[PDB]
């Protein structure tokens, strides 16, 4: 993707994450855990459903048209055949480009949602953590399950840990 | 502590085409081209299966077409080994003649 | 005997395109030459 998260600085996806598209994995004093992020998951799904809504269940009614299978007649039949062949090639083109374009965009929007979640998390942690470059943050303070949970649900107060974190980050 | 951000993956991915790549694997895809029919013109329709009957044969009555001499149909199904004739011959303007019959409604 | 009609038989019309027959009647998907066209409905799959 153009943002460089999915198939980028995030080395691979998690097959064990089956309750959401994006999420958090942590390791702390109490153990190792995994939890999906619902808002970013839903944001991606809503955009894809928006595309589907434009394409699925919206066909157009045609009734009496021209004949499209035929005795040799020459001129007029040449014209009827050419008209239909022209029309099919133009629709076949539209269909091909539509899928190639939407797919490029779908892959880019899903990569974007991953990047947004990462950026949002980074800003939350302020000076209390460092980006390890693989989608992981090293958090420079004791962070139990409730602390990790507060980060995931956007209630993390960085000021609470800042002194502990700064001392750990900036030493020898 | 460590907090890692990530996304899901599946073991059974699907290959799709994009603007920049002929073959890229995504977690899921849906088919946009309908490629099959159930072989019937729709329940709620009045249909006749000529079967062994050739269609043109309905007009002139070989033994085959005995059932279908005066058939009434919304949907008419021709079949492959069907013979329009009992005594060898062919219709002049044959393909043109059938197209008349198919859209007739019956005769 | 148990909306879109083609000479091959009726076809579902949930899909926008169809490869069955250029001859159609009713609310039908549009005839195209491709036999398949996959629309991604998920992110890039990156296993390991």
């Amino acid at each position, epitope marked *: 993707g153009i943002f460089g998260a999915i198939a980028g600085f995030i080395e691979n996806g998690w097959e064990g994450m089956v309750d959401g598209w994006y999420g958090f994995r942590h390791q702390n004093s109490e153990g190792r855990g995994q939890a999906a992020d619902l*808002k970013s998951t839903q944001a991606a799904i809503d955009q894809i459903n928006g595309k589907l809504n434009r394409l699925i269940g919206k066909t157009n009614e045609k009734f009496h048209q021209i004949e499209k299978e035929f005795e040799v007649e020459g001129r007029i039949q040449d014209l009827e055949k050419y008209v239909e062949d022209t029309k099919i090639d133009l629709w076949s083109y539209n269909a091909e480009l539509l899928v190639a374009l939407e797919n490029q965009h779908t892959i880019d929007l899903t990569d974007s949602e991953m990047n947004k979640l990462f950026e949002k998390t980074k800003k939350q942690l302020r000076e209390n953590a460092e980006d390890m470059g693989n989608g992981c943050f090293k958090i420079y303070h004791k962070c139990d399950n409730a602390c990790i949970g507060s980060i995931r649900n956007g209630t993390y107060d960085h000021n609470v840990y800042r002194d502990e974190a700064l001392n750990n980050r900036f030493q020898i | 502590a460590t907090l890692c951000l990530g996304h899901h993956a599946v073991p059974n991915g699907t290959i799709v085409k994009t603007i920049t790549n002929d073959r890229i694997e995504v977690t899921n895809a849906t088919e946009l081209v309908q490629n099959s029919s159930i072989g019937e013109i729709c329940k709620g329709k009045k249909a006749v299966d000529l079967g062994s009957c050739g269609i043109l044969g309905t007009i002139i009555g070989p033994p085959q077409c005995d059932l279908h001499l005066e058939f009434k149909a919304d949907l008419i199904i021709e079949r492959r080994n069907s013979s329009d004739i009992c005594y060898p011959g062919r219709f002049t303007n044959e393909e043109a003649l059938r197209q008349i019959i198919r859209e007739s409604g019956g005769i | 005997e148990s909306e879109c009609f083609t000479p091959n038989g009726s076809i579902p019309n949930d899909k926008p395109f169809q490869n069955v027959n250029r001859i159609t009647y009713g609310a039908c998907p549009r005839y195209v030459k491709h036999s398949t066209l996959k629309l991604a409905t998920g992110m890039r799959n990156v296993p390991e």
Partner: antibody
Amino acid sequence: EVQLLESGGGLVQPGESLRVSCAASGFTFRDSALSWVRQAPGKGLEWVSAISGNGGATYYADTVKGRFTISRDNSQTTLYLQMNSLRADDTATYYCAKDESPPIYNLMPGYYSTYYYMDVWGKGTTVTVSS
Amino acid sequence: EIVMTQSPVTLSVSPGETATLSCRASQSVRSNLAWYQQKPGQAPRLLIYGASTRATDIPARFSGSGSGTEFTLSISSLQSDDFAVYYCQQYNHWLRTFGQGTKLEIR
């Protein structure tokens, strides 16, 4: 059997709060969406809100955009609706309604498919707001 | 934020005749549209969803149609128990809206 039962409601003074429960019983595994719809006798139907998965909705009508809040308790299989700052026009028969979507949508089973139609309606609880 | 207007407010139709209802909707709407039959003293019951796809195990006399703005609901063979009120909803604006309601009469 996919019936749900609405409990609560009653008479309340304008400005007070009141939450209505919806015991989701039956076929509903409660990975599907649920909604609330109110109707006052003498008026038509009006969609109120919706819930999805966990905290994916967040979907409220403009009439109650700043007053009503929708809760979901999957452990006890009950849908809630905290109606705060009730006004006079909030008097209605609040219906708890199932939500179904075409199978092409709803990619992840839990999250919200932004196209729902209500199939199984509830018995309804009448809430009267006066002095 | 997307108003629905049904027409008329009430209609009188003899039992047996077809009763066509209207559900005019401001702004385009096609994917999602549901019809309901709320009999007095009862909760609404789903009849058709999407536009034409009727609900499970409902009579075939309930027909649905429409596109974008104008939507119709026709009851083929009318029965004396169809004296209910009918409504129509829409997608989406993340905010579904209902219709005003159409009262159906049966002398």
